Amino acid sequence: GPVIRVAGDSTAVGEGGRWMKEMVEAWGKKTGTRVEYIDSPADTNDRLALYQQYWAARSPDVDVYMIDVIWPGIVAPHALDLKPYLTEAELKEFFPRIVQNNTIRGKLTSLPFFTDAGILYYRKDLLEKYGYTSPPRTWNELEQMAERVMEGERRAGNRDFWGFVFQGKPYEGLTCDALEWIYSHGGGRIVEPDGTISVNNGRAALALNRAHGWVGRIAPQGVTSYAEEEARNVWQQGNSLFMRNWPYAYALGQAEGSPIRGKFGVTVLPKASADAPNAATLGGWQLMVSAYSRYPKEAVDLVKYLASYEVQKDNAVRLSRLPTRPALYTDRDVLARNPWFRDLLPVFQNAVSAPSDVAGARYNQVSEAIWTEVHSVLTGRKKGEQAVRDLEARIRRILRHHHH
Numbered sequence: 001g002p003v004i005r006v007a008g009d010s011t012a013v014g015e016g017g018r019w020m021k022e023m024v025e026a027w028g029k030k031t032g033t034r035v036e037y038i039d040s041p042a043d044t045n046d047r048l049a050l051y052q053q054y055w056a057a058r059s060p061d062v063d064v065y066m067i068d069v070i071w072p073g074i075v076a077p078h079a080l081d082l083k084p085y086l087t088e089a090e091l092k093e094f095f096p097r098i099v100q101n102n103t104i105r106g107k108l109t110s111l112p113f114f115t116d117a118g119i120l121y122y123r124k125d126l127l128e129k130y131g132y133t134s135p136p137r138t139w140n141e142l143e144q145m146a147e148r149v150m151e152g153e154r155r156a157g158n159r160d161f162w163g164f165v166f167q168g169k170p171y172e173g174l175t176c177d178a179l180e181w182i183y184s185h186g187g188g189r190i191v192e193p194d195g196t197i198s199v200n201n202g203r204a205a206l207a208l209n210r211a212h213g214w215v216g217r218i219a220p221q222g223v224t225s226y227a228e229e230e231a232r233n234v235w236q237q238g239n240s241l242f243m244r245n246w247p248y249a250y251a252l253g254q255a256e257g258s259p260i261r262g263k264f265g266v267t268v269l270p271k272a273s274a275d276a277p278n279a280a281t282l283g284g285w286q287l288m289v290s291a292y293s294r295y296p297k298e299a300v301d302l303v304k305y306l307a308s309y310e311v312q313k314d315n316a317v318r319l320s321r322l323p324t325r326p327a328l329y330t331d332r333d334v335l336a337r338n339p340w341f342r343d344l345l346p347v348f349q350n351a352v353s354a355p356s357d358v359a360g361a362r363y364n365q366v367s368e369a370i371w372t373e374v375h376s377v378l379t380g381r382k383k384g385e386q387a388v389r390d391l392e393a394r395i396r397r398i399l400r401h402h403h404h
């Protein structure tokens with residue numbers, strides 16, 4: 001019979017690729033359908049370029065793609081409209097904000113699978129050791145704590161120890177970290193939902209100068225090459241006081257054999273001042289049926305299974321990844337395993353989106369501009385002032401004649 005072929009999460013990041021293969025295999029066994037899993041590069045922008053080769057070819061070789069929250073506007077022509085396959089009641093079981101994100105000119109491109117938000121991981125053992133009772137609420141506090149703890153851990157012989165790790169590589173992940181920096185300084189959303197390119201302002205410039213100030217000081221020099229996993233690996237070995245990352249890192253750090261099991265918490269990322277907005281960049285992945293799949297019915301069935309209550313539950317319990325169904329946030333087993341889901345749910349609901357809605361099919365060009373200009377600040381090539389001016393000009397060229 002048919003072989004349903006799935007381009008799912010990458011095996012190069014955490015456990016999500018192995019887990020998703022196992023879920024697809026379980027669906028295949030449950031339904032008596034042959035399945036195959038197609039692996040991906042780690043970084044989301046590299047994954048998009050891979051999937052675009054299949055789509056440009058109208059290839060029937062992949063039936064189901066796991067797609068980023070930032071992609072619906074780009075990928076819509078390559079997606080089977082799911083709307084006729086779901087009742088309204090089924091659709092209302094997902095957060096409406098994500099269903100809306102996934103809907104482009106009325107086409108339901110994809111089902112919400114798991115959401116994501118940037119958060120602050122912190123070593124609570126080390127905060128206590130050094131006389132701190134809460135994680136930092138301001139970036140100034142984060143810097144002061146990092147400097148003091150670093151000075152002590154280094155003095156005590158840990159030459160690998162750093163204050164903060166984050167995603168500073170030139171790729172999409174830096175756009176996510178930089179939106180948090182800019183927004184949490186009162187610098188705006190880089191491109192506002194109404195289309196105003198707002199990034200050339202002194203608050204955004206400051207945010208980027210501050211991040212430069214970390215590099216080689218409280219963060220490693222090499223942070224300018226770090227993606228999710230490079231950051232995670234320094235953190236997880238016990239060598240960083242703080243890390244900015246997504247929720248998936250929590251389960252991994254609690255696993256048996258993790259050096260930091262039981263030694264950390266999570267909270268909202270800090271901000272420049274009490275009246276700035278909390279910043280957590282909205283991430284997450286959706287499930288798309290290819291417009292080129294020869295087997296739409298079977299592929300839709302698989303996508304509904306993967307998005308189902310019990311599979312999202314398993315994702316939350318085993319991999320600490322965030323459901324797209326509100327009902328899971330009141331499930332006793334989900335909350336017993338991840339009590340921090342309760343405390344941070346509002347942070348997750350208030351997550352700030354990158355400008356994918358307003359940039360539409362041009363988002364990947366806009367994001368490339370953002371990460372390259374930001375990266376040039378982190379490397380010390382440019383100051384924040386110049387970078388936000390240059391970024392404004394690049395985004396104006398890219399979005400010229402684009403209306404949302």
Ligand SMILES: OC[C@H]1O[C@H](OC[C@H]2O[C@@](O)(CO)[C@@H](O)[C@@H]2O)[C@H](O)[C@@H](O)[C@@H]1O
Pocket residue numbers: 009010013014016043044068069070115116172173174176228246247248282283284285
């Ligand atoms: O790098 C930006 C990108 O980060 C997240 O996706 C990448 C991987 O992170 C996960 O560990 C989930 O947290 C994996 O499942 C993903 O493959 C984020 O979800 C994206 O929205 C974002 O563009």
